[PDB]
């Protein structure tokens, strides 16, 4: 049962949850990886890792992925959550120098992961290990696009460091543009392709129906996170959240901003439903009778199916994960799974 202020009946009725068959082994394998890469203290991994549900989130998203692909995606995604925690803690503790150094190492490790596999900063070494494995599935042209996208993500995190140290809440339009980068919209979209086993040519993945379906899936996910993580983010002096931008710059009340965010999330769903039809029609056109065409057709169909699965996986993740349960913390500004 989902709280009424967070409930989306269309998701519950029309987007049935999916779970990848590898998820049991995925759960333990990623937890051991967090342990062995020293990405979180051992006692916090034991106490909190399974309850954070990071592997469940990815296992309900990239259906059909080969087990080894899903493992690399799950390790990268767990790393990404820890990086968000590190970013937050560097901000809270005014560690501008340590962040600047981290920011630079992640740029370098993204271009040359093998050089960073044993870096003294375990967060860098953990990133390099996951990126190394992601680079082993598709041609170097896909690797280059992943890197180009993630370079921008790192720099969007640096913009968040600038905003939060300076006490700046971005405007609504400014926030929406930045959120497509801090959420890594295009990274999750890139990773559809190794999950279906096919790098898509530019003419396919830029087709208007594919691009708009991919966008809507990510806008829903990011804004639903905003809706669900608003309580912890207000408690933690986070400034990056559509709700916070609305309260600050449009002088909405909390209740008004929650409603506005809800409506925007709801429209992503029904816009997606319409564009989903066009994207599946495109998949049908790709099946032109050739072997390449059937290949491309099946890949697009699988990818669009997983764009749909992102809606349900993100929805349920926010009600299962301990990441957001701010009411259970002794210090509402300091989550217990963060190294402070
Ligand atoms: C801050 C963590 N995360 C994912 C690693 C960064 C993009 C956002 C997120 C939250 C909830 C579901 C999916 C992604
Ligand atoms: Mg965060
Ligand atoms: Mg963040
Ligand atoms: Mg959030």
- Is 85 annotated among the ligand-binding residues? no
Show the DSSP H helices in the chain as ranges: 9-14, 23-36, 42-52, 54-59, 67-92, 96-111, 122-134, 140-165, 172-182, 185-196, 202-205, 208-235, 242-250, 254-286, 291-320
Question: For the domain 1-340, what is the CATH code?
Answer: 1.10.600.10
Q: Where are the alpha helices (DSSP H) in 166-207?
A: 172-182, 185-196, 202-205
- Closest Cα to atom 8 of ligand 1: 183
Terminus-to-terminus CA distance in the chain, angstroms?
Answer: 33
Does 88 belong to an annotated binding site?
yes
- Say how many Å lie between the CA of residue 14 and the centre of ligand 2: 29
Is 225 annotated in some ligand binding site? yes
In Å, what resolution does this model reach? 1.8
Residue 272, CA distances (Å) to 12, 45, 155, 275 in order: 15, 37, 29, 5
Check if 184 has its Cβ closer than 6 Å to any atom of ligand 1.
yes
**Residues 309, 303: Cα–Cα separation, whole Å:** 10
Query: Best substitution site from 30, 58, 62, 81 to test ligand 1's pocket, by max atoms within 8 Å of Cβ?
Result: 81
Residue with tokens 């890197």: 147
**Residues shown for the chain:** 340
What are the domain boundaries of the chain?
A: 1-340
**Residue written as tokens 């999950």?**
195
Experiment used for this model: X-ray
Q: Taking the CA of residue 269 as centre, how many other CA atoms within 13 Å lie in the half-sphere pointing to its CB?
A: 20
* Tokens encoding 279: 């994207």
**3-state secondary structure string across 102-139:** HHHHHHHHHHCHHHHCCCCCHHHHHHHHHHHHHCCCCC
CB 309 near ligand 1, within 6 Å = no
Among residues 58, 47, 113, the alpha carbon closest in space to that of 80 is found at 58
């Amino acid at each position: 049962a989902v709280p009424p202020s967070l409930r989306l009946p269309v998701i519950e009725a029309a987007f049935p949850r999916q779970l990848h068959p590898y998820w049991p082994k995925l759960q333990e394998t990623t937890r051991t990886w967090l342990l062995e890469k020293r990405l979180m203290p051992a006692d916090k991994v034991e106490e909190y890792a399974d309850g954070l549900c990071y592997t469940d989130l990815m296992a309900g998203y990239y259906l059909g992925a080969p087990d080894e692909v899903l493992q690399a995606i799950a390790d990268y995604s767990a790393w990404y959550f820890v990086w968000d925690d590190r970013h937050d803690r560097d901000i809270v503790h005014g560690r501008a120098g340590a962040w600047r150094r981290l920011r630079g190492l992640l740029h370098t490790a993204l271009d040359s992961p093998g050089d960073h596999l044993h870096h003294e900063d375990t967060l860098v070494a953990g990133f390099a290990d996951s990126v190394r494995r992601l680079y082993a599935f598709l041609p170097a042209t896909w690797n280059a696009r992943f890197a180009r996208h993630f370079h921008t993500v790192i720099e969007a995190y640096d913009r968040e460091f600038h905003n939060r140290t300076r006490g700046i809440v971005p405007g609504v339009e400014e926030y929406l543009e930045l959120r497509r980068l801090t959420f890594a919209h295009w990274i999750w979209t890139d990773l559809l392709e190794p999950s279906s086993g096919c790098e898509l040519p530019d003419a396919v993945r830029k087709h208007p129906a594919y691009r708009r379906a991919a966008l809507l899936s990510q806008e829903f996910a990011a804004w639903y996170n905003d809706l669900c993580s608003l309580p912890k983010e207000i408690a933690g002096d986070e400034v990056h959240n559509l709700g916070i931008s609305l309260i600050t710059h449009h002088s909405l009340t909390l209740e008004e901003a929650i409603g506005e965010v809800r409506r925007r999330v709801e429209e992503c769903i029904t816009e997606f439903l319409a564009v989903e039809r066009d994207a599946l029609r495109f998949a049908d056109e790709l099946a032109d009778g050739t072997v390449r065409g059937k290949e491309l057709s099946g890949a697009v169909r699988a990818n669009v199916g997983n764009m749909r699965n992102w809606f349900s996986s993100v929805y349920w993740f926010h009600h299962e994960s301990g990441r957001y349960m701010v009411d259970s913390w002794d210090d509402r500004s300091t989550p217990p799974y963060v190294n402070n």
